[PDB]
Structures are given as structure tokens and as C-alpha cells.
Amino acid sequence: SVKSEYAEAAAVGQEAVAVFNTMKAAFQNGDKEAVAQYLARLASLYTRHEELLNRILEKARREGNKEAVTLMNEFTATFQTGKSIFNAMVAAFKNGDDDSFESYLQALEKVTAKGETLADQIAKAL
Numbered sequence: 736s737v738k739s740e741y742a743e744a745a746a747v748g749q750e751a752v753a754v755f756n757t758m759k760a761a762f763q764n765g766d767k768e769a770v771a772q773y774l775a776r777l778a779s780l781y782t783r784h785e786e787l788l789n790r791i792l793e794k795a796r797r798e799g800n801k802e803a804v805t806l807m808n809e810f811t812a813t814f815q816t817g818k819s820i821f822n823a824m825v826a827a828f829k830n831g832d833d834d835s836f837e838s839y840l841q842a843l844e845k846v847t848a849k850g851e852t853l854a855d856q857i858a859k860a861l
């Protein structure tokens with residue numbers, strides 16, 4: 736169902752969460768070789784999450800589930816904020832700009848934490 740597909744999507748989100756927090760530790764430790772690898776891993780995860788989310792939204796639309804569509808339209812808009820900040824973080828790492836990397840990192844955390852109440856509301860709406 737769309738609901739199982741959302742639980743599948745949620746798990747990918749939590750995996751990216753887990754990797755993100757291991758990457759932060761590595762960055763703080765200066766282990767750039769680890770950071771580079773975790774940034775690759777997070778890119779692949781977010782790319783997969785984004786695609787699963789699109790499929791869920793399209794299915795909610797085909798189902799006529801107006802409330803779930805409203806919530807998913809907002810949730811995906813927030814996701815794209817995250818993706819933009821993530822991409823800026825990756826560029827800061829490429830550039831050696833640790834000040835920008837720290838900034839982007841904390842912003843990506845706050846953006847993600849905010850969007851959590853909506854993430855749970857979608858689960859209940861589908």
C-alpha cells in the first residue's frame with residue numbers, strides 16, 4: 736500500500752539521519768576521508784528518498800486523498816530546502832570552507848527537526 740511505501744520511505748530517511756550524525760562526528764574530528772564517503776552515501780540516500788516521496792505523492796493524487804496530497808506537497812517543499820542546504824554543504828566541503836560547512840550542517844539539522852511533526856502527520860493521513 737501507499738502506507739507501507741511510506742514506512743519504507745521513512746526508514747530511508749532514518750538511515751540518512753544515522754549517516755548524517757556519523758558524518759558530523761567525523762567532520763568535527765577532521766577525518767575528511769570519512770566525511771567524503773559519508774557525503775557520497777547521503778547523496779545516494781537523499782536521491783532515493785526524494786524519488787520514493789515523489790511516488791507516494793503521485794499515488795496519493797491518483798487516489799484522490801486530498802489531505803495526504805496537501806501534506807505531501809508541503810513536506811516535499813521542505814525536503815527540497817534540505818536538499819539545497821545539503822548540496823551547499825557538499826560544495827563547502829569541496830571548497831575547504833569549514834565555516835560554511837558548519838553553518839550548513841546546523842541549518843540542515845534544524846530544517847530536518849522542524850519537518851518531523853509533518854512527517855508523522857503524513858503517516859497518519861495516507
Ligand SMILES: Cc1cc(CO)c2ccccc2n1
Nearest residue numbers: 748751781784814817818847
Ligand atoms: C533523506 C532525507 C530525510 C529527511 C527527513 O528525515 C529530510 C528532510 C529534509 C530535507 C532532506 C531530507 N532527506
